[PDB]
DNA sequence: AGACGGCTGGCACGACTTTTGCCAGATCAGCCCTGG
């Protein structure tokens, strides 16, 4: 509900439309898909969805679907009421349940193994997750929001990703425009990144931007995303020096031998 | 008198019991120090 303090810096007149779209999704409990490319700041949008929802007071755990162990999947997702030691007074909590009352964020959906895919598909459709041991089903209420950069229709075509959980979890998608599509906010991000760098390196003052530098970073196909642009500025501002002259040289990729 | 049947015990082979040998840590509550 309360707008958390985050950097979205939106002026592209397309990012504003995406922001309105996600704001419309803020109250609803329906599953949400975030579609983007490398970088693109999808995590900020996901945090925006969770943190402007009715259940925002709830927790906001975010699991890395690539990071879950294969064998330990069941206990990791559910937990075991039995303690680690004899006569234990408590148990470890699984990924699920630890999310109840709030949203669960999923990332790298495409690279999730088939074991994760099939185990996660069963739990969402019905809930009633049961920890290993005992016969007591616990009912859960968790919002799911996920972000990915690969092409899950192609993943379905190859069959390396099950289409059923996709269909269940594809109520609505939000499209994120690439930085090259935005092509208007580059000045403001460049400047904000440079100002942050000024304090990080403890440089005294920002020198300024030359027209040649503006032309070169503007006239770029930008396969890299906002973070690639961020790193670019980071490299050039440091290589420039102590701001006695305006910033003049931009190195697009630090790989050319020279 | 010799062979046949019978009785008993040692040894062996699964199947199941029972005997010992493991060696802390995290977590919570009250008191003391310190900031408002
Ligand atoms: N609007 C924005 N404001 C501030 N930073 C941004 C914005 N968009 C992108 N970024 C930067 O780009 C990065 C994208 O990270 P992330 O969303 O994790 O990429 P991916 O979704 O591919 O994993 C973030 O670390 C963030 O610092």
């Amino acid at each position: 509900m309360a707008e958390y303090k985050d950097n979205l810096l939106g002026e592209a007149n397309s990012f504003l439309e995406v922001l309105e779209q996600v704001s419309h999704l803020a109250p609803l409990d329906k599953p949400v898909l975030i579609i983007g490319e490398r970088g693109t700041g999808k995590e900020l949008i996901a945090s925006r969805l969770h943190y402007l929802s009715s259940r925002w007071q709830g927790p906001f755990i975010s699991l890395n679907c690539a990071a879950l162990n294969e064998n330990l999947l069941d206990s990791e997702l559910f937990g075991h009421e039995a303690g680690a030691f004899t006569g234990a007074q408590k148990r470890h909590p699984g990924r699920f349940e630890r999310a109840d009352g709030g949203t669960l964020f999923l990332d790298e959906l495409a690279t999730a193994p088939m074991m994760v895919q099939e185990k996660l598909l069963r739990v969402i459709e019905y809930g009633e997750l049961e920890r290993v041991g005992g016969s007591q089903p616990l009912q859960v209420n968790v919002r799911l929001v996920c972000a990915t950069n690969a092409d899950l229709p192609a993943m379905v075509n190859e069959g390396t990703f099950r289409a059923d959980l996709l269909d269940r979890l594809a109520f609505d998608v939000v499209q994120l425009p690439p930085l090259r599509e935005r092509e208007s906010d580059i000045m403001l991000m460049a400047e904000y990144f440079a100002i942050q760098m000024c304090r990080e390196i403890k440089l005294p003052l920002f020198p300024g931007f030359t027209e040649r530098a503006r032309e070169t970073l503007l006239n770029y196909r930008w396969p890299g995303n906002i973070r690639e642009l961020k790193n670019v500025v980071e490299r050039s501002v440091y290589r420039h020096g102590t701001s006695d002259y305006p910033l003049d040289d931009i190195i697009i990729d630090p790989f050319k031998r020279r």
Side-chain angles (χ1 to χ4, degrees), chain A residues 1-220 222-258:
Chain A
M1 155 61 88
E3 278 69 3
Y4 63 168
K5 289 104 289 303
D6 72 302
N7 301 359
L8 56 91
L9 324 180
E11 189 65 7
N13 191 28
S14 70
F15 174 110
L16 287 65
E17 287 54 20
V18 196
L19 184 50
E20 160 70 311
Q21 184 63 289
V22 47
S23 68
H24 269 280
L25 281 207
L28 285 315
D29 192 33
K30 312 318 152 283
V32 181
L33 218 35
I34 291 312
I35 273 295
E37 299 69 14
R38 302 182 300 171
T40 317
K42 302 180 287 307
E43 56 204 349
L44 298 191
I45 295 301
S47 54
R48 149 69 31 84
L49 214 43
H50 159 86
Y51 254 122
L52 294 197
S53 73
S54 60
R55 49 171 60 228
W56 66 303
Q57 309 293 62
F60 186 36
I61 36 179
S62 47
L63 90 171
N64 168 16
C65 320
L68 289 323
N69 181 288
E70 254 301 353
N71 280 80
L72 214 30
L73 214 166
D74 257 345
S75 166
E76 192 38 271
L77 211 29
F78 292 168
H80 47 99
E81 55 275 62
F85 289 178
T86 39
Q89 69 296 119
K90 60 189 61 180
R91 95 260 301 182
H92 95 120
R95 287 287 153 297
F96 272 56
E97 142 251 60
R98 191 187 302 180
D100 189 1
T103 73
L104 201 43
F105 169 83
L106 317 100
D107 212 357
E108 316 56 55
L109 196 57
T111 44
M114 214 31 50
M115 258 331 309
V116 152
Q117 184 64 342
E118 54 198 318
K119 197 60 59 66
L120 192 164
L121 174 46
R122 176 62 173 290
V123 302
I124 168 62
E125 41 190 290
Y126 294 130
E128 330 307 328
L129 82 172
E130 62 278 17
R131 326 154 193 76
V132 293
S135 184
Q136 163 47 42
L138 195 60
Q139 185 289 313
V140 85
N141 171 222
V142 47
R143 203 182 132 66
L144 282 37
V145 279
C146 186
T148 188
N149 68 320
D151 207 23
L152 51 79
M155 304 316 337
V156 165
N157 298 353
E158 287 101 51
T160 88
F161 182 82
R162 177 166 297 187
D164 303 21
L165 179 171
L166 151 62
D167 181 21
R168 307 294 274 92
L169 181 130
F171 163 91
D172 187 1
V173 306
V174 153
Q175 168 299 328
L176 280 295
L179 194 171
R180 171 203 38 63
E181 276 191 0
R182 321 255 290 250
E183 80 191 339
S184 149
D185 300 1
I186 48 146
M187 313 340 289
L188 315 91
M189 326 325 151
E191 294 209 358
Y192 193 146
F193 301 162
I195 301 308
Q196 287 298 156
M197 200 23 48
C198 287
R199 294 167 288 243
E200 200 266 352
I201 179 178
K202 343 323 172 182
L203 262 202
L205 172 75
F206 185 68
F209 275 130
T210 48
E211 176 276 341
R212 57 152 320 184
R214 296 168 165 262
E215 176 56 33
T216 166
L217 83 173
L218 166 65
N219 189 2
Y220 178 49
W222 281 109
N225 70 93
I226 304 177
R227 73 168 58 185
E228 198 298 300
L229 154 79
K230 218 310 185 185
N231 303 0
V232 170
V233 167
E234 309 249 15
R235 166 59 15 81
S236 290
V237 61
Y238 192 14
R239 304 282 69 66
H240 162 113
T242 183
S243 307
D244 38 357
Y245 62 116
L247 169 151
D248 47 348
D249 189 13
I250 306 304
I251 317 295
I252 171 65
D253 60 321
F255 265 65
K256 59 165 292 292
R257 193 24 147 167
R258 158 100 34 83

